[PDB]
Design a protein around this motif. Sequence first.
Motif, PDB file in Angstrom:
ATOM      1  N   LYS A 143       0.850  -1.199   0.000  1.00  0.00           N
ATOM      2  CA  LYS A 143       0.000   0.000   0.000  1.00  0.00           C
ATOM      3  C   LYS A 143       0.863   1.217   0.000  1.00  0.00           C
ATOM      4  O   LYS A 143       1.821   1.293   0.777  1.00  0.00           O
ATOM      5  N   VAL A 144       0.594   2.125  -0.927  1.00  0.00           N
ATOM      6  CA  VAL A 144       1.348   3.381  -1.027  1.00  0.00           C
ATOM      7  C   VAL A 144       0.365   4.515  -1.101  1.00  0.00           C
ATOM      8  O   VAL A 144      -0.724   4.395  -1.727  1.00  0.00           O
ATOM      9  N   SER A 145       0.732   5.614  -0.445  1.00  0.00           N
ATOM     10  CA  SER A 145      -0.170   6.732  -0.239  1.00  0.00           C
ATOM     11  C   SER A 145       0.592   8.036  -0.333  1.00  0.00           C
ATOM     12  O   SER A 145       1.697   8.142   0.200  1.00  0.00           O
ATOM     13  N   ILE A 146       0.023   9.027  -1.005  1.00  0.00           N
ATOM     14  CA  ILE A 146       0.634  10.381  -1.059  1.00  0.00           C
ATOM     15  C   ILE A 146      -0.412  11.392  -0.627  1.00  0.00           C
ATOM     16  O   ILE A 146      -1.533  11.312  -1.104  1.00  0.00           O
ATOM     17  N   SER A 147      -0.086  12.277   0.318  1.00  0.00           N
ATOM     18  CA  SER A 147      -1.016  13.319   0.782  1.00  0.00           C
ATOM     19  C   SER A 147      -0.348  14.648   0.665  1.00  0.00           C
ATOM     20  O   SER A 147       0.792  14.790   1.108  1.00  0.00           O
ATOM     21  N   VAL A 148      -1.054  15.607   0.072  1.00  0.00           N
ATOM     22  CA  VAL A 148      -0.571  16.977  -0.106  1.00  0.00           C
ATOM     23  C   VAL A 148      -1.753  17.932   0.167  1.00  0.00           C
ATOM     24  O   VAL A 148      -2.924  17.512   0.139  1.00  0.00           O
ATOM     25  N   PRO A 149      -1.455  19.211   0.423  1.00  0.00           N
ATOM     26  CA  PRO A 149      -2.532  20.181   0.623  1.00  0.00           C
ATOM     27  C   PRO A 149      -3.357  20.383  -0.644  1.00  0.00           C
ATOM     28  O   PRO A 149      -2.819  20.388  -1.726  1.00  0.00           O
ATOM     29  N   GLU A 150      -4.668  20.499  -0.482  1.00  0.00           N
ATOM     30  CA  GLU A 150      -5.505  20.875  -1.602  1.00  0.00           C
ATOM     31  C   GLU A 150      -4.936  22.124  -2.218  1.00  0.00           C
ATOM     32  O   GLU A 150      -4.489  23.037  -1.519  1.00  0.00           O
ATOM     33  N   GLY A 151      -4.897  22.119  -3.527  1.00  0.00           N
ATOM     34  CA  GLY A 151      -4.355  23.247  -4.250  1.00  0.00           C
ATOM     35  C   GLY A 151      -2.899  23.109  -4.637  1.00  0.00           C
ATOM     36  O   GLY A 151      -2.399  23.939  -5.428  1.00  0.00           O
ATOM     37  N   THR A 152      -2.204  22.115  -4.079  1.00  0.00           N
ATOM     38  CA  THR A 152      -0.835  21.821  -4.443  1.00  0.00           C
ATOM     39  C   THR A 152      -0.869  20.949  -5.713  1.00  0.00           C
ATOM     40  O   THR A 152      -1.623  19.970  -5.786  1.00  0.00           O
ATOM     41  N   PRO A 153      -0.087  21.313  -6.731  1.00  0.00           N
ATOM     42  CA  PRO A 153      -0.073  20.424  -7.902  1.00  0.00           C
ATOM     43  C   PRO A 153       0.544  19.073  -7.554  1.00  0.00           C
ATOM     44  O   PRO A 153       1.466  19.017  -6.780  1.00  0.00           O
ATOM     45  N   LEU A 154       0.020  17.995  -8.114  1.00  0.00           N
ATOM     46  CA  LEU A 154       0.559  16.687  -7.875  1.00  0.00           C
ATOM     47  C   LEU A 154       0.504  15.901  -9.187  1.00  0.00           C
ATOM     48  O   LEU A 154      -0.534  15.805  -9.823  1.00  0.00           O
ATOM     49  N   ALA A 155       1.650  15.425  -9.635  1.00  0.00           N
ATOM     50  CA  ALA A 155       1.672  14.452 -10.727  1.00  0.00           C
ATOM     51  C   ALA A 155       2.181  13.160 -10.109  1.00  0.00           C
ATOM     52  O   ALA A 155       3.125  13.169  -9.322  1.00  0.00           O
ATOM     53  N   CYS A 156       1.500  12.062 -10.411  1.00  0.00           N
ATOM     54  CA  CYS A 156       1.916  10.779  -9.878  1.00  0.00           C
ATOM     55  C   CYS A 156       1.573   9.666 -10.845  1.00  0.00           C
ATOM     56  O   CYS A 156       0.598   9.741 -11.629  1.00  0.00           O
TER      57      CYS A 156
END
Length: 505
Positions: A143-156
């Motif tokens: 299991k892998v998980s990435i959490s960032v603040p709403e509004g932060t760009p995320l490419a994954c």
Amino acid sequence: AASEAEYGKVSKAWTLHADGSQEYRSSMELTLFTHTAMNSTYGESFIVYNPDFQTLKIHSSYTRQKDGTIVKTPDNAFVEVLPRFAADAPAYNQLKEMVVVHTGLELGATIYLDYSIITKPGYYPALDINERLQETSPVKECKVSISVPEGTPLACGLYGSPVKAVEESHDGIKEVHWTLRNIPASSREAFQPKNREASPHLVASTYPSGKAALATLDKRLKESQGYESKTFAQFLTDKSGNEQEKVNIIRDHILNNLSTCPIPMAMTGYTVRDIDTVLRSAYGTPLEIAQLLNVMLNAAGIPSEVLAVYPGHLDTDACGLAAIQTLAVKATVDGKDQYLSASPLTNRGGLDKVVSLSGTSIEIETTPIQIKESRSVAISADQAKDGFAICVLPAISAGIDSWGMSALNSKRSNLFELPSLIREEVTYTVTPAEGMKLQTSTQEQVISKPFGKVTRTITPRGNTIEVVRTIELNKQQFTPAEYSDVRSLIHEWTNPDNRVLLFSL
């Protein structure tokens, strides 16, 4: 190995907070089934971090024996040491590696370890992930998980697996997770591709783009004035006639005077010491050395840029700096580019994606290494008193003979990859003793296959015999269907019998 151990569970979670702080949390369950497994480095866990900006928190560490007994790791089984990569490198002597010695191991016991690395604001410019998910043992669930603040760009992206992202927002946080099941152990086969495309990897970035990641690196590289380095570069090259001589002077000065300190970029927050300090200290990280060379070449009138090398299967618009595998420098010499790196970029060519720090992709050509050598061999009537003299023409060192391929398996399940394309010619001049008679046929030996050829010619000339051996290999990667043909070439080259000349007295 494979049925020697199994990871029942792996869970990795990355979090970026609004202030730029991060957390990485890693938990695992690892069952060891043999003493071979227990007595290997599976007996320990190794956790590297930089205490100037990071703290290590162990949430739990214990061994569960088959009967249910729980053996908690005692305090004296946690030992902190300097990572080996930082040895003899004073500027990095704060770096830490926690070694957890797993206690209570018995056949069929399961190691549990759950820890976090917490990074304070101001160390990482972005969340920047390139995580291998396949291990040398099977992983039942990952299991892998990435959490960032709403509004932060995320490419994954999850490469090497078809598993789809599940997106979940909550509490002003944007989270994405994946669950992989039954990841096979990696193959123990030698000479698999440097970048295995079917080997699951999570790659992700919160930079605005891959280009922005590279531009950020460049800005940080350029933050030191490098005044001395530039002035020194000019002094060093002021006499020189041509541009090539200037490149050679600068490159050789650096090669001769700086040792390379293999500190991962993550352990330096993706930056460099002040470049004049690098110059004076006589050691540098790959990144430091690349920038020093770039600064000095440019100061010397050779337009130059740092290049990042990524695996060839990656979407480099969607990754950060963590996916970079190598650095190089491009130098333009009389209108023609050449590349400076530990190994030539043209060895792997288009297997990899090469991008300048200003963001331009470069279609690197794939160029064969060229080897041409000569050897002389005398044979005495001493060596043939008992009827025959067996003359073994000596093998050379450089090229295919250094690739470690003299004993290739006949069966192959994975892609087979060569370090480079290659062309070699070795000429032996053999002078036998008077009256020795060549029993070996002088007929030419040729093996020709779709992707290469090996030849041997034997030509008497006066009282010498000239033996010429050639090999060319013209493709880099081979499927199992193609493997037998390239193996027969490589074997024709390396098989010692193919270098024997027999004489009768």
